[PDB]
Structures are given as structure tokens and as C-alpha cells.
């Protein structure tokens, strides 16, 4: 650190000429003080992009944590410097870095009200659901400080990702149902064919939502798909009733998504939902209620003749 | 319990006439002693199906636990009485009931070597992976006591279910990859089209394994599908290399499944694997290695002209 504090003073003061001469003399770029503050940290805190650029040209550490846990990305997000946030992310800065409080840079940018920083951070995969030591998400810090547009963006993104996961879940339940109905002790081929058709339709619904999210410039974020509630359904009637309950749940979440889109003043999302999703749900619920009442009138489940003939005449 | 011990003596001794007269007098069926032993427990321990049938006709408790945790299903599985196991399962006996040791009835039937009980229990959804206080699965208790055919059945079932889950996993990785390549900052349409095609092919592979498992009379058992390792792939080259690594892993697990099937003397499973799975894996690995070497020779990833022209000419 023979020229390391000579880099610290120029990083505090912002002289491109001084750091150009120090790199002409080969000054060390990883000069850490007693508390871990690097020349890159002061370059970020100051807001001069040129010293940051040349520090990264000579191989400064992009993810150097101090004694408090802050990286240059944290300080850049605090003070609202967009270009250095962009070039730090361009050089492999960890977007979900936690400090001593567990606060990611997205927490800071949502707490202080910087839109463009929030959007660039969301583009690189910042976690929407990260909680700090108090159990606060960035959505909570944005509503507590009156940054309502940030909270709108953060709420809509989470809601669309949850709808994608919910459509992927329903396809797997139908797969389970379909392969229950061609076991050799449940020999109903048209039930199995019907539920395989529903499985593929739900896969298409999820893919449509993914395409929509890519057209808007939002960030798809996938989660686990959990296993269905049963491996063993019990009859055709019971499986039809479970399918009706499922489609009603999906319709309810779609209505909540539409109300959220109407609060956020997004007419394109509202028209997308009511054109491709809201009428199909109504049709499906009408058809499944039809199937349930006909099966109950014929005398199922305690009549094995009823499910055989329903298999032949309605599903055939 | 004015006639409850009068039911206990006939349950110990097995008189259908005595219990018929006691039900003509309306004897109570839920007569618990000081240690919880019901008339159904002794009816199961004895092995006379008629007293069990009439006890269930008058509404005896099928899932009555004693002070040690045993139900009638536990004792029935211990002593090897098939018909009463069947009718207990037919009346809603819990197939995964744990005792004080955490040992399910499947643990007992595997420890003592009763094949037909094991198979009827597997039909109703018995957990293959249940561990007792020592961390023993029924497979461990079957190998420790020399019941090699039980262990063969238990091993093959688990292996096919894991292959189903592994094919479902690979489809979701390809879905992730496909929707990475049509982000507005990754504008490669033919990459995205290619990976959507692979996603649907893997869904078909999993469904074929499910159909095979239903033809043999085995029990499909579905698990969670975990999310892919990345949301952000980095280039066409990096995604092609990850896809190659993935298909090599799948091929290795298929080879282990084939070796297990050859130890179990199952020629139909061996021919199924080598007819529908082993040649497709070889083709896929050859094609993905082709793509990787051509992309590396053209100069990717650090040439953006290389991936554009590969997109046009090879994937177009």
C-alpha cells in the first residue's frame, strides 16, 4: 500500500489523472484499510464512473465486503448512482448480497425511492422475497416510505410469477388423475384421455403467461412444483369434484390478479386476462359441474354401471 | 363392557356363533381393556376373518392404537394373515401407521418375509422410504433377514420412481433455458424454439415411464420437482454445455436402472429401456457435442456474430 492511500485520496476526491498516473506507476488496486474500505468503495460512494472503470480494468474486487457487509453495489444503490450500478452488475457483482442486517441492495433502492436502480436490479435477478432481520421485504420498505410506484411494480411481478407456478401445479394434478384411471383395477380409458387433455391445456396456459411476461420486459422466476394431494383418487365422481374445486381456486386467483392490475392502471394486462383466461374458466366450471350432476343422477359411485356408461357416452 | 369381555373371550377363541348371539343382544364393539386391546385386535391376531367382518359390520374402530402403537393392521401383517389385511385396507385402515418404534406394517411384512402382504400394502400406497428409530427402511429389514425377492421388488420400484422424477426435472430445465433466450436482451429465437422442443420431448419420456409402470401393476409415486440451477444462462455456448452435462447424467442413471433390471431377471424391462431410451440418449449426446464444437470453432461466446449465424444456419 505504498500507493494504496494515494489511491484512497484520489478515490475520495475524484481525479482521473491521479489514478491514471498511479496505474502508470502500477499502484495496487486492492488496498484495504483497517475497516475493509477499498478504493472501489470510495469510487462508488463518490459517483465518478471513470475511476470505477479503470479500477475494474486493473482487476479490483467487485464483491469486497467491509466489516459491516457492504459492497460497492450496496453503496451505489444507497446514493442513487445508476451507471456505476450497471457497470458493477456488468462485471459480476452479486445482486443478492446481504449486509450485516441482511438487507440486499434492492432493499436500499426500494427504501430510498430509486426506480431505475430497482428495475436494473430486477433485470439481473434480484430476489423479491428477501427478508432482513426484521422480516421486511423490499415491498414493505417501499410502502413504509411512500414509494407507491415501486411497490406497484414489486407486487405485480410477484403476482404474475405466482400465477405461473399455479398453472404449472394444476397440470401435474391432471397428470396424476389421468394415470390413475388406466391402472388395471381402474379400467376407464376415456377418463384417462380426458384428464391428459386437461394436463396439456394447463401447460399451454402457463406458457402463455411466460410469453406475456417476456413481452413486458419483466423477470420470470420459477419455483418448485409440489406433488398433488393424492396418488389415489377414488372414483370418477370424486376426481371430477376435485377438478371442479381446483378450477374454482384458479379462477379466484385470476380475479385477484385482475383487481391488482386495475389498481395499477394497466389496461393491457386487464384485457389480456379477460380475453385469454376469464372465459375459459367459466366454460370449464360449467362443464365440470355438468359432469358432476350427471354422474350423481346416474347413481355413481356406488353404481359401477353408471361410470362405465358415462365413460362410453359422454367422454367417448 | 357388560358383554365386552364376553366379546374378548370369543375374539381370543374364535366363535362366530358366540359373537352372532352377542350382536343379537347388542354387545358393544369398542371394548377397550387397560392396555387398549380391542376385540378387533384379538380378532386380527387370531386370524378368523368372520369375527373381523362382523365387528366391522357393527362399526368397530379400524385404527385403534394400543399403548404400544399397534393397530389391527400391524398385528395382521406380523402374523401373515392376508385376507384380514385386505379387508382392513378395504375399510379404511391407515397404511402408513407408525408404532412406538416408528415401524409401519410394511416394515413388519418385509422383516418377516410375507410377499403377498407386501404387494397388497404397496398397492394401497405404503411408503417405501419410511425409516424407524434406527433409520432402517423396509429394504434394509428385508436384506438383513435374507428376503431377497422382497428387496428386489422394493429396489426396482424406487428406482423407476426416481427415473420418473428425473425426467420431469429435465423438462423444467429446458423450459427455463427456452424462456431465457427470448428476453429482449437475448434475442435468439431459434435457440428458444430448440429448447422448447426438448422440454416437450422430456415430458413425453416421463409419460412413457408412467405408462410402463401402470402396465406392470406397480405404484406410481410422485415427488416435488425442484427448480433449475440458474435463472440466467450466459450464452448459447454455456447453455449447450449445460444441456450436454444434463443428458449425460440422465444416461448414467438409465444405465444403472438397466443393470438393476438385469440383476432382478426382468427381460421385459431391459428390452423396454434399450429400445426406447438408450439410443435416444446416444443421439442427443452426439448432437449436443456437435453443437458445442461448432460454436467453439466459430469463436463464441466472445463473438456475437458467431451465435447469430449459428442461430440462422444450424437451428434455422
Amino acid at each position: 500500500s505504498e500507493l494504496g492511500k494515494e489511491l484512497l485520496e484520489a478515490a475520495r476526491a475524484g481525479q482521473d489523472d491521479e489514478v491514471r498516473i498511479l496505474m502508470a506507476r502500477g499502484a495496487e488496486v486492492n488496498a484495504a484499510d483497517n475497516t475493509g474500505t477499498t478504493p472501489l468503495h470510495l469510487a462508488a460512494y463518490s459517483g465518478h464512473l471513470e475511476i470505477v472503470e479503470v479500477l475494474l480494468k486493473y482487476g479490483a474486487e467487485v464483491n469486497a465486503a467491509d466489516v459491516f457487509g457492504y459492497t460497492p453495489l450496496h453503496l451505489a444503490a444507497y446514493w442513487g448512482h445508476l451507471e456505476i450500478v450497471e457497470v458493477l452488475l456488468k462485471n459480476g457483482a452479486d445482486v443478492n448480497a446481504r449486509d450485516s442486517d441482511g438487507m440486499t441492495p434492492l432493499h436500499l433502492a426500494a427504501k430510498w425511492g430509486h426506480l431505475e436502480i430497482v428495475e436494473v436490479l430486477l433485470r439481473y435477478g434480484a430476489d423479491v422475497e428477501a427478508q432482513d432481520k426484521f422480516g421486511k421485504t423490499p415491498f414493505d420498505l417501499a410502502i413504509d416510505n411512500g414509494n407507491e410506484d415501486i411497490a406497484e411494480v414489486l407486487q405485480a411481478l410477484l403476482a404474475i410469477n405466482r400465477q405461473i407456478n399455479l398453472e404449472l401445479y394444476a397440470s401435474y394434478v391432471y397428470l396424476s388423475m389421468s394415470y390413475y384411471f388406466d391402472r388395471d383395477d381402474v379400467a376407464l380409458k376415456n377418463f384417462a384421455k380426458y384428464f391428459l387433455h386437461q394436463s396439456h391445456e394447463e401447460r399451454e396456459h402457463a406458457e402463455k403467461l411466460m410469453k406475456l411476461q417476456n413481452q413486458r420486459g419483466g423477470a420470470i422466476s420459477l419455483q418448485d412444483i409440489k406433488k398433488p394431494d393424492c396418488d389415489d383418487w377414488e372414483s370418477g365422481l370424486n376426481a371430477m369434484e376435485c377438478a371442479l374445486h381446483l378450477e374454482k381456486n384458479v379462477n379466484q386467483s385470476l380475479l385477484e390478479l385482475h383487481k391488482l392490475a386495475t389498481d395499477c392502471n394497466d389496461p393491457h394486462l386487464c384485457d389480456f386476462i379477460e380475453t385469454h383466461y376469464l372465459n375459459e374458466q367459466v366454460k370449464a366450471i360449467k362443464e365440470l359441474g355438468d359432469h358432476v350432476t350427471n354422474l350423481r343422477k346416474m347413481g355413481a359411485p356406488e353404481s359401477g354401471l353408471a361410470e362405465y356408461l358415462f365413460d362410453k357416452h359422454t367422454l367417448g | 363392557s357388560e358383554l365386552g369381555k364376553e366379546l374378548l373371550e370369543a375374539a381370543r377363541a374364535g366363535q362366530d356363533d358366540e359373537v352372532r348371539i352377542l350382536m343379537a343382544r347388542g354387545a358393544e364393539v369398542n371394548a377397550a381393556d387397560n392396555t387398549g386391546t380391542t376385540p378387533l385386535h384379538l380378532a386380527a391376531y387370531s386370524g378368523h376373518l368372520e369375527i373381523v367382518e362382523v365387528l366391522l359390520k357393527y362399526g368397530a374402530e379400524v385404527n385403534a392404537a394400543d399403548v404400544f402403537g399397534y393397530t389391527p393392521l400391524h398385528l395382521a401383517a406380523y402374523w401373515g394373515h392376508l385376507e384380514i389385511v385386505e379387508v382392513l385396507l378395504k375399510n379404511g385402515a391407515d397404511v402408513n401407521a407408525r408404532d412406538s418404534d416408528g415401524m409401519t406394517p410394511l416394515h413388519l411384512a418385509a422383516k418377516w418375509g410375507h410377499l403377498e402382504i407386501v404387494e397388497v400394502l404397496l398397492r394401497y400406497g405404503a411408503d417405501v422410504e419410511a425409516q424407524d428409530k434406527f433409520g432402517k427402511t423396509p429394504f434394509d429389514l428385508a436384506i438383513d433377514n435374507g428376503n431377497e425377492d422382497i428387496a428386489e421388488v422394493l429396489q426396482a420400484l424406487l428406482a423407476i420412481n426416481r427415473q420418473i422424477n428425473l425426467e420431469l426435472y429435465a423438462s423444467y430445465v429446458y423450459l427455463s433455458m427456452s424462456y431465457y433466450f427470448d428476453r429482449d436482451d437475448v434475442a435468439l429465437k431459434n435457440f428458444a424454439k430448440y429448447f422448447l422442443h426438448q422440454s416437450h420431448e422430456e415430458r413425453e419420456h416421463a409419460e412413457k415411464l408412467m405408462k410402463l409402470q401402470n402396465q406392470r401393476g406397480g405404484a406410481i409415486s410422485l415427488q416435488d420437482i425442484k427448480k433449475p440451477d440458474c435463472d440466467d444462462w450466459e450464452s448459447g455456448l454455456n447453455a449447450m454445455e449445460c444441456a450436454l452435462h444434463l443428458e449425460k447424467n440422465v444416461n448414467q442413471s438409465l444405465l444403472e436402472l438397466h443393470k438393476l433390471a438385469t440383476d432382478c431377471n426382468d427381460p421385459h424391462l431391459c428390452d423396454f429401456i434399450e429400445t426406447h431410451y438408450l439410443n435416444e440418449q446416444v443421439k442427443a449426446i452426439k448432437e449436443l457435442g456437435d453443437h458445442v464444437t461448432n460454436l467453439r470453432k466459430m469463436g463464441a461466446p466472445e463473438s456475437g456474430l458467431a451465435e447469430y449465424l449459428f442461430d440462422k444456419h444450424t437451428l434455422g
Binding site: - | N34, T35, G36, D66, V67, F68
Partner: protein
């Protein structure tokens, strides 16, 4: 439990050597145990030679091997509380009111 029938000499006796002679040279010999066993047997006896005489009966051999591998009965009065403690242990065990460890550590104190 090894239960040993023995012949105690009274501690107030001035007849020590007479009874010792009667016990050693007449009782605990072949003919003394033979004469008492003609009316009622003693099973496993303490004298080695008479054990070899009676070991042709396999009941006697089984009794002496269980006796030599068994636990000698305690001569102490706390044993009484033993018969009050550990008995309740199995009353908590075969009845299932307690578990194994609960019953045994309840019989411990």
C-alpha cells in the same frame, strides 16, 4: 435366583464342635444327603461328590448349571423394597402405563 438351603448354628450355642461334626462328617457327605433324599430330595446340593451322584438325573444337572450361572439371593433387608420396587416396574411394562426406561428408573429410586 440361587436359593441355598443352609444349616445355621445358633450363636448362643455352647455346642459348636458337636454340631460341626454332625454337619461335616455326617450331613454333608454321601450317606447323609442320601438318607435325607430317600424321603424328600434336595435337587442340586452343595457337596461335590453327591452332585456327581445326583447328576444322572438331568433335572439336577439343569438345576446346578442354572445355579452356577445364576445370581445368589441377597441377604439384606433392602431386598424387600426391591420386591416392592421392580415388581411395579413390570406392572408399568406389561400393562404399558409407562415405557421401559420410565418403569426401570421408577424402580431405581
Amino acid at each position: 435366583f440361587v436359593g441355598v438351603l443352609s444349616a445355621g448354628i445358633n450363636a448362643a450355642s455352647p455346642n459348636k464342635e458337636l454340631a460341626k461334626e454332625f454337619l461335616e462328617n455326617y450331613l454333608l457327605t454321601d450317606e447323609g444327603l442320601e438318607a435325607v433324599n430317600k424321603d424328600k430330595p434336595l435337587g442340586a446340593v452343595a457337596l461335590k461328590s453327591y452332585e456327581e451322584e445326583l447328576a444322572k438325573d438331568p433335572r439336577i444337572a439343569a438345576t446346578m448349571e442354572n445355579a452356577q450361572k445364576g445370581e445368589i439371593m441377597p441377604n439384606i433387608p433392602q431386598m424387600s423394597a426391591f420386591w416392592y420396587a421392580v415388581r411395579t416396574a413390570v406392572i408399568n411394562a406389561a400393562s404399558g402405563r409407562q415405557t421401559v426406561d420410565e418403569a426401570l428408573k421408577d424402580a431405581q429410586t
